Amino acid sequence: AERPTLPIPDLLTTDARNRIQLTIGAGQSTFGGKTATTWGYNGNLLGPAVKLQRGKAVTVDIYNQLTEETTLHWHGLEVPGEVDGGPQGIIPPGGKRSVTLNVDQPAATCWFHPHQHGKTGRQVAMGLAGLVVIEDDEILKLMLPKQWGIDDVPVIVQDKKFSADGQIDYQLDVMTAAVGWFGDTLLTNGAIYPQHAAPRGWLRLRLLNGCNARSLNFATSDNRPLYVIASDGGLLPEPVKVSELPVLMGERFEVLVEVNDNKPFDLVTLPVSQMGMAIAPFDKPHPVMRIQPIAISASGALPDTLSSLPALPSLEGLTVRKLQLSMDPMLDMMGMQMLMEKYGDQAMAGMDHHMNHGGKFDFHHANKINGQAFDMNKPMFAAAKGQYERWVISGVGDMMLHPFHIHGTQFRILSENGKPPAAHRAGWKDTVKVEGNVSEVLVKFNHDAPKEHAYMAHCHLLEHIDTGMMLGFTVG
Ligand SMILES: [Cu+2]
Ligand SMILES: [Cu+2]
Ligand SMILES: [Cu+2]
Ligand SMILES: [Cu+2]
Ligand SMILES: [O-]
């Protein structure tokens, strides 16, 4: 049997009333020939790509047809707290909420997903994620590959595991609270190892790591390079050639890759040094999708220059905020123990050389920032509006991977886990690696967020969010 074609999310623009309609609902999908209940936006699984233009306002009407509450957060969008769709942005089951997004940031690939309090991991695992394609005047002048689903394609990479009956096997338990929910089956826009037919020339891939907990590292099967043109928050100043591209949970990169006649190749993910993530089949390079060259010329360009990246400002005088991540030691130890007991030594491959005691010992509030498991009723601080701040985020105290994400902003990384950032990570980012060390970012918030619709700052390993590793903050 041939590989299925790569599914392409619909690219959705506004109607005459200036509205985009998103319906959140349950349906069925098929994986390895077996039906599973899944959730999607405007469909059974995943979601569309919402197209936004800088300087234009759109209204999004969001219909929750689930039987449980949800929220809809626009990861990477610089919007006021009131429309941010964090855990306070509740959409009742069977209800509708509308938001007006006044887009004011550069071209970028962002995404959207639920932020339901304590249930974000489950709701993403069940299928809910969509994309956001922001354009501006600058990017169109570059003449990059631009034919959606032909030479400009989104690639949403996610793992799942399934029970014997075919259903998605999600659990938030002591093991997954520590190390995350991860699986043995890799999906690419919902499909298992699809093919994508691409014209000769440049192919633009908009890569999203949509896994709950699994870090990825993209490369090609024949070692042809990837030319990174954009990070979370938009274009780099010029392309950065890489042989491999690590991507943390919730991160996006756009790359160009060459397509040549008669030479199919795979996009793959290489084994990562993260606990639990190198269990077979992920102990070896794992195909993500096959690129099948078509002998028709593609028109897109890889320009020498992409955008202007402003200089980092002087750091003296700027407010320095400390955010100390932590995990309860006992529940960290217990989750790791359960991982080791289940999978053995392979659960640490590639790393460096039972009674009820009450609510005090509950893993549901075991993970914390500044000594506090997330309290939706108490923002931890008020950040300045329109002012650069230096946020220092420490994971010293444990060795888990914490891709740290801050709502309401695109920031510049100053130190990523104790080193200056790689060139392709030195531009606009909404995520920074924290793993047993300290990161520092330069952040600015252009929009207000009140106590009642506060911004969040959190680890993007979803099971850590749901077990407390998040804080709220206000702006303005
Ligand atoms: Cu996110
Ligand atoms: Cu976000
Ligand atoms: Cu974490
Ligand atoms: Cu978030
Ligand atoms: O998020």
The alpha carbon of 70 is separated from its chain's Cα centroid by a whole number of angstroms, namely 18
- What's the gap in Å between 306 CA and the centre of ligand 5? 27
Query: Is-same-fold flag (1-146; 317-476)?
Result: yes
- The tokens of 129 are what? 């994620």
Q: Is 425 close to ligand 5, i.e. is its CB under 6 Å away?
A: no
**Among the listed residues 241, 217, 238, the one whose alpha carbon sits nearest the alpha carbon of residue 227:** 241
- Positions at the binding site for Cu cation: 73, 75, 113, 115, 402, 405, 407, 458-460, 464
- What's the gap in Å between 439 CA and the centre of ligand 1? 19
- What's the gap in Å between 253 CA and the centre of ligand 2? 16
CA angle at 134 for the pair 114 and 77, rounded to the nearest 5°: 45
Pairing outcome for strands 11-12 and 19-31: unpaired
**Among the listed residues 399, 397, 393, the one whose alpha carbon sits nearest the alpha carbon of residue 442:** 393
Bridge partner residues of 226 (DSSP): 242
461 and 213 Cβ atoms separated by less than 8 Å:
yes
Q: Is 75 close to ligand 5, i.e. is its CB under 6 Å away?
A: yes
- What's the gap in Å between 250 CA and the centre of ligand 3? 12
CA angle at 384 for the pair 383 and 388, rounded to the nearest 5°: 105
Which class is domain 1-146?
A: mainly beta
How many Cα atoms occupy the beta-carbon half-sphere of 179 within 13 Å?
21
124 and 40 Cβ atoms separated by less than 8 Å:
no
Q: Is 464 close to ligand 5, i.e. is its CB under 6 Å away?
A: no
- What's the gap in Å between 334 CA and the centre of ligand 2? 29
Bridge partner residues of 256 (DSSP): 204, 227
Asked how this structure was determined, the answer is X-ray
Q: Is 405 close to ligand 5, i.e. is its CB under 6 Å away?
A: yes
Q: The domain 147-299: what is its CATH number?
A: 2.60.40.420
Ion ligand 4 neighbours (CB, 5 A) are 456
- What's the gap in Å between 171 CA and the centre of ligand 1? 19
Reported resolution in A?
1.4
Ion ligand 3 neighbours (CB, 5 A) are 402, 459, 461, 464
Residue nearest (by alpha carbon) to ligand 5 atom 1: 75
Q: What is the 3-state secondary structure (H, E, C) of the chain?
A: CCCCECCCCCEECCCCCCEEEEEEEEEEEEECCEEEEEEEECCCCECCEEEEECCCEEEEEEEECCCCCECCEEECCCCCHHHCCCCCCCECCCCEEEEEEECCCCCEEEEEECCCCCCHHHHHHCCCCEEEEEECHHHHCCCCCCCECCCEEEEEEEEECECCCCCECCCCCHHHHHHCCCCCEEEECCECCCEEEEEEEEEEEEEEECCCCCCEEEEECCCCCEEEEEECCEEEEEEEEECCEEECCCCEEEEEEEECCCCCEEEEECCCCCCCCCCCCCCCCEEEEEEEEEEEECCCCCCCCCCCCCCCCCCCCCCEEEEEEEECHHHHHHHHHHHHHHHHHHHHCCCCCCCCCCHHHCHHHCEEECCECCCCCCCCEEECCCCCEEEEEECCCCCCCEEEEECCCCEEEEEECCECCCHHHCCCECEEEECCCEEEEEECCCCCECHHHCEEEEECCHHHHHCCCEEEEEEC
- Positions at the binding site: 73, 75, 113, 115, 402, 405, 407, 458-460, 464
The contacts of residue 147 (CB under 8 Å, 6+ apart) are: none
**Among the listed residues 284, 267, 271, the one whose alpha carbon sits nearest the alpha carbon of residue 195:** 267
Domain 317-476 has CATH 2.60.120.860: no
Give domain limits for the chain.
1-146, 147-299, 317-476
